[PDB]
Design a protein around this ligand. Sequence first.
Ligand SMILES: *[C@@H]1O[C@H](CO)[C@@H](O)[C@H](O)[C@H]1NC(C)=O
Ligand SMILES: *[C@@H]1O[C@H](CO)[C@@H](O)[C@H](O)[C@H]1NC(C)=O
Lengths: 226, 226, 224
Amino acid sequence: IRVFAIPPSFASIFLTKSTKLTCLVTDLTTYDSVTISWTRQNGEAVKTHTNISESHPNATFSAVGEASICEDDWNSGERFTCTVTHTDLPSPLKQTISRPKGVALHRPDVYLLPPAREQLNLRESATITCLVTGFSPADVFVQWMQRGQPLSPEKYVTSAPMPEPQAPGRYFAHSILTVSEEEWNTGETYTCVVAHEALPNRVTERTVDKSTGKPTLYNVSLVMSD
Amino acid sequence: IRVFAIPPSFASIFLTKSTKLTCLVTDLTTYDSVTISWTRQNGEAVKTHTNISESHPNATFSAVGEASICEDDWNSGERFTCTVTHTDLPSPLKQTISRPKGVALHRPDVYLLPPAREQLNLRESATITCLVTGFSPADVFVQWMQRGQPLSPEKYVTSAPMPEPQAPGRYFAHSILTVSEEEWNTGETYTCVVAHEALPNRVTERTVDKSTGKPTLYNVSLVMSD
Amino acid sequence: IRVFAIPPSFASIFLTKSTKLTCLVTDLTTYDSVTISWTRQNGEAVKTHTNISESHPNATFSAVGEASICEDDWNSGERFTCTVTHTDLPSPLKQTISRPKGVALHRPDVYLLPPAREQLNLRESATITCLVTGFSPADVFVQWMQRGQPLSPEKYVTSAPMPEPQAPGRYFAHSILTVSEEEWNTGETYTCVVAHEALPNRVTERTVDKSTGKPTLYNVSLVM
Ligand SMILES: *[C@@H]1O[C@H](CO)[C@@H](O)[C@H](O)[C@H]1NC(C)=O
Ligand SMILES: *[C@@H]1O[C@H](CO)[C@@H](O)[C@H](O)[C@H]1NC(C)=O
């Protein structure tokens, strides 16, 4: 019986606006004799909602329990222990998780790149790049919004954090968005929202527009009619 | 005892300029009774050099089987076979690897993006991105050069190919090269070479320099009547 | 009976992407008693496809034979031997061929020049020259491409490498492409691909057009 209880990820916490735990238990034969419950250091019982998934092809069943806990408990590093009881287990299987301390925190620097002109000449599609670098540790959520309305999660692809070459400890990642030529030429404004723990306000935003950085042009005419 | 044969990759053959074969066998109790032999499909024997690595922490041993084969035969279609004989295994284990067929070919397009103005205003470093998108299959090699001589493999980090949601079956990838602000302000030239199967010459290059894409700031129209 | 066995040059290797051998035999009387077959240094029966040509006007025949070899085998340094057997020859004629060693490597410098303004003023045609200079040894392959499409080999003529008086050992060569001015005044861009054995990636490219050379900052003009 494989009993796993992953910690709540930062991205999931920011997306769902709540703290939910999960004790994934697999390799189960009988799903009618399972019980999943979490507790604190003192021993107070925590209301845990257990759900039963489908039957795995290897004749094994899954038991998932989820509970809602106030961010303060997890943020404080309070240890959460999962309780698993089954008829095939002579003793219950329990695991303890907490927060790893001594973690470096550096606010990420966000850079937004506009589409190359040579690409626009083909009249096919434009690509806007949102670079996020110098963040610690690897927990970053990148979201693209247009005119204050979030976009669908299909139009952009977000990479995974990778170590920086010159600076150990610093990570970096970047995502791209694909838009049609006419929408870009119309004059729409796009924004890149980045969510990180080390940020003072936890949220920073960068915007891009067709008319951004265009230098002043000069049109001089001379007659010199002696 | 597990037998794992790793077929050569485009980048590996493109680098060493030769085709190499790896037949990795792990979970070996005794390393003095292992025979790694490469045999062609027809029946001819291929020389294999046996090399033994260190001892794994889990009381297991691994062996490496290396064979040299002409690159013209790898894409011909004929299969290979790595034979492993050991006292523990009652019968030898065999593996079959070849080049798959049934994948369309597409020409990657290379776009070069200069660093953002905000980063240069901060005056710390500069980031050049060599985007490579619209290709199939997923074997691409990217290298950076400046003023003819190549660059060290530590100054840039590439990303594994990822599917493009807008072009099913077409992939994309991006390479980032970090340089100092002073070197960028000098007026140096940087290039990213891309190697792919579908390219007629299998080599495509793009050039970037501080002075690129600058529009016409002035427009003087001298007139006269004489 | 004369037997000629040429080596596969770099130009052919790059053009057909497959190393091929040839052992031409001339001054032949009977074509029914000729057998051409290549062999390895240690001795092997290399698959040779013998072909029969026509009859020369001087009442002599000729024969050819091809044998495919993995490129690495050739550049490795192995010497070969061509086997010729005939009823009129008491002993077979064997020739040993190999590539020379001990050659300094010089990367080719590529340059592109636009047509002269007088030729355009003539309103007839144009000629673009691709200069490949300062390279050694003398084995180069120049190809032209427009709109990412290889151009008909009847449009450009290439020159065989010639020694450079300025420096000893290095060579130089160039090719010209003729295009009418009607196509030239559309802003068409032309590419000159150079293939060599000393380049890191064996391929170099250059581009030319009207916008190449004109200043980009100011736009001075006259109205008259
Ligand atoms: C500059 O002046 C010329 C006439 O001298 C005119 O054709 C052109 O439109 C002017 N530029 C702009 C940006 O209006
Ligand atoms: C420069 O002036 C000419 C007329 O002299 C005009 O045709 C052109 O549009 C002008 N350039 C720009 C960028 O407006």
